[PDB]
Amino acid sequence: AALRQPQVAELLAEARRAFREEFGAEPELAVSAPGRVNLIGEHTDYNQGLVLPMALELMTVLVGSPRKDGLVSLLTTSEGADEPQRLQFPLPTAQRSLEPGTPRWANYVKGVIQYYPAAPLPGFSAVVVSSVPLGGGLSSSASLEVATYTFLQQLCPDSGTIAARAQVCQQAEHSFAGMPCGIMDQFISLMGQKGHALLIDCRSLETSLVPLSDPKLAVLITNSNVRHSLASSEYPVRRRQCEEVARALGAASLREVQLEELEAARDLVSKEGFRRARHVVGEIRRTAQAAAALRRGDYRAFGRLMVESHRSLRDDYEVSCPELDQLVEAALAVPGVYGSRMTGGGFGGCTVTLLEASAAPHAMRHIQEHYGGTATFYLSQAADGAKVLCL
Ligand SMILES: O=C1CCCC2=C1C1(CCCCC1)N=C(Nc1nc3ccccc3o1)N2
Ligand SMILES: OC[C@H]1O[C@@H](O)[C@H](O)[C@@H](O)[C@H]1O
């Protein structure tokens, strides 16, 4: 069966009670930011490509109050978070900046604080809760970054765009978590809307809300519950390989490159380099094609495109793994399934499946039975982005 997904009210209540017991007073502020699944458009965001994620009902919630002593005091109740579950530190200054360290979960909060553009930022007390599986492939860290950003805005309103907010959270990921992500994760956490996926053009930063609310249609997320170390170390390698190919062809990015141009300049790049670029160029196309298909309500074409995306990721970009592949192959054997593919960075994490709603229970049974391991399932509607509630 699919794991329960606590409503924001439940996570709010848990966070509020925790805060009350922890700090001896009621919290004054509450925010939430969702994790996400990427329907299609993988390893294209840092290539100034197209991506089509949707926000999940899985989310991170922060409750808290401003302090008058310029200190930051944190507590998380998430099991899976590394010890200690509490941390305190003074606000950064011009002379002293925050630094990444232990516990790692606090690095995301520290990073957002460090690069928060508006001032004066006061200190604060906060409790962090989440229903997003920590490092499970659904951007738990993006949701924490965006939840944190959304909280800091209540303490000290910025005056910029939503893209600038995503880039701040992205810089936190780069500099405090050592993960040089693209913009997708933060952007969808910020900009998600219930009942819609979000087509993001990562070159222009133009975004389009694409309706995705059809009873009869379901999105099944399957967690492999594995994560090879390559997910961390091979990710930056992929970025460098794409940059090298773009540089060899005199292109600002692979978004400017088409398959024909790529093959014509085959002698100018490495064998594997060609494989990487071919995926990227094809995946941008497929995402454009997927967006249109989803518009038409053509789930069969959308599904077929998801499958091409996985095969490309598996064979050209080489960021899949036997676990993900077995999960995909299993799902495609189930009647009523339109398509299935690995989602997110790869080397573990989740797959995403588009299927007839009625097929979801039978999909879960069969996928689990064919998965030589322990799969976890989520059935998720397209959810809202970051929100605020005054307490
Ligand atoms: O293992 C690393 C590397 C792989 C990516 C992954 C991290 C960990 C680092 C800290 C310990 C758990 C795993 N954190 C998540 N993100 C996260 N989101 C959170 C929301 C609320 C509370 C805590 C949270 O941690 N991402
Ligand atoms: O599509 C692959 C994705 O991998 C994620 O892990 C990363 O945070 C995103 O920015 C995007 O690059």
UniProtKB/Swiss-Prot annotation:
Gene Ontology annotations for the cellular component aspect, listed alphabetically: cytoplasm; cytosol; extracellular exosome; membrane
Enzyme class, first EC level, given as a word: transferase
Superkingdom as given in the UniProt entry: Eukaryota
EC number(s) per entry: 2.7.1.6
Residues engaged in binding ATP: 135, 137, 139-140
Gene Ontology molecular function, alphabetical: ATP binding; galactokinase activity; galactose binding
Catalytic reaction(s) noted: alpha-D-galactose + ATP = alpha-D-galactose 1-phosphate + ADP + H(+)
Key words, A-Z: ATP-binding, Carbohydrate metabolism, Cataract, Disease variant, Galactose metabolism, Kinase, Nucleotide-binding, Phosphoprotein, Transferase
Keyword Transport listed: no
Gene3D superfamilies, per the entry: 3.30.230.10, GHMP kinase, C-terminal domain (3.30.70.890)
Function, in words: Catalyzes the transfer of a phosphate from ATP to alpha-D-galactose and participates in the first committed step in the catabolism of galactose.
Protein name according to UniProt: Galactokinase
Lineage of producing organism: Eukaryota, Metazoa, Chordata, Craniata, Vertebrata
